[PDB]
């Protein structure tokens, strides 16, 4: 919900074309009182409480809470026998059907989220094999998230990814108050 | 718009077993979009409703209403198609089972009342539906006699129970 922007919009009884004048004066005939066409009571009139402009749904949970969510999802994946850790993602052939057969034989599941590091040391074999599959999704470690881990049945990390995740998620504990954003030097913070 | 009366003549029955009633012929006909009021047409249809074909034509020939000649024409085409298409040997051996009028699609016009005021005039249209069955007209139901009245009163007396108890 934090990135959602809703572009739905209606016209109020002031943005609908026409309607300036008062039809059939107030007291004469036996009709109901009206001061404008384009009022919400009229066909073709404005909308009383419709959607207004592009609306944003932006909010932020505390980064400690979000890191806790990441740790919680990793814990659940391990506790439910859904986590697998590899030394490295490497395939002798590099074709999608090999990886699908391997997952089926190892009884992983239907949807597999493979996690690597830095997006640049991803080997050509797994890149080529996964770029064609639909339920096998290759992401770098920087892209790990609760929604993807819940959407995919199994999580497959590497050992460097495990160490990276451990360090990044542990840093949130035993850390000071910000005192200014962490994109600034912070002598011991890389 | 619905046209289902037209398709009632397309029904094909399986051949009857030799030892079976004759299954008299059944012919449906109609005229759509008649420039007439449907109530005015209903009166003529109600008059024609129970008669045989010849008696109905005779009655419609000497009625001085606009719809009388229209219904006469419809009945004549129905009789012709009954003899020609639906295998009715005797052209006079037909009676009217159903005869009714229905509302058609109408138009709206302005009436120009005697000020800057006005009314909406409706240009009325109607349909006429007829159905002919082969065979003599069924006899009219005789009025019930005092014997029948007494019989039903006695049966009403005999049917009563002791209510609100065992």
């Amino acid at each position: 919900n934090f990135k959602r922007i809703s572009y739905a919009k209606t016209k109020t009884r002031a943005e609908v074309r026409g309607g300036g004048r008062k039809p059939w004066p107030q007291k004469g005939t036996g009709r109901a009182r009206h001061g404008s066409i384009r009022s919400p009571l009229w066909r073709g009139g404005g909308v009383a409480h419709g959607p207004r402009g592009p609306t944003s749904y932006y909010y932020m949970l505390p980064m400690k809470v979000r890191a806790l969510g990441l740790k919680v999802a990793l814990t659940v994946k391990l506790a439910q026998d859904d986590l697998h850790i590899m030394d490295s993602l490497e395939l002798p052939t590099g074709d999608p059907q090999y990886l699908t057969e391997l997952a089926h034989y190892r009884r992983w599941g239907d949807s597999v989220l493979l996690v690597d590091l830095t997006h640049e040391e991803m080997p050509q074999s797994i890149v080529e094999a996964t770029s064609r599959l639909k339920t096998f999704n290759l992401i770098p470690a920087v892209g790990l998230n609760v929604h993807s881990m819940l959407k995919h049945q199994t999580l497959v990390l590497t050992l460097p990814t495990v160490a990276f995740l451990e360090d990044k998620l542990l840093w949130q504990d035993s850390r000071y108050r910000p005192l200014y954003p962490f994109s600034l030097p912070y002598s011991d913070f890389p | 718009i619905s046209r289902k009366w037209e398709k009632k003549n397309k029904i094909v029955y399986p051949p009857q077993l030799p030892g079976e009633p004759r299954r008299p012929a059944e012919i449906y006909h109609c005229r759509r979009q008649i420039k007439y009021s449907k109530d005015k047409m209903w009166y003529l249809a109600k008059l024609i409703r129970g008669m045989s074909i010849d008696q109905a034509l005779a009655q419609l020939e000497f009625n001085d209403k606009k719809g009388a000649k229209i219904i006469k024409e419809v009945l004549l085409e129905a009789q012709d198609m009954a003899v020609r298409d639906h295998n009715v040997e005797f052209r006079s051996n037909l009676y009217i089972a159903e005869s009714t009028s229905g509302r058609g699609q109408c138009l709206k016009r302005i009436r120009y009342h005697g000020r800057g005021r006005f009314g909406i005039m409706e240009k009325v249209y109607c349909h006429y539906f007829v159905k002919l069955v082969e065979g003599p007209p069924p006899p009219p139901e005789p009025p019930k006699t005092a014997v029948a009245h007494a019989k039903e009163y006695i049966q009403q007396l005999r049917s009563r129970t002791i209510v609100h108890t065992l």
Binding site: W24, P25, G28, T29 | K108, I110, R115, G116, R117, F118
Partner: peptide
């Protein structure tokens, strides 16, 4: 006073 309400003509297309 002389209170009069002029009649209203509906659109001719109806």
């Amino acid at each position: 006073k002389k209170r009069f309400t002029p009649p209203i003509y509906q659109p001719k297309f109806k």
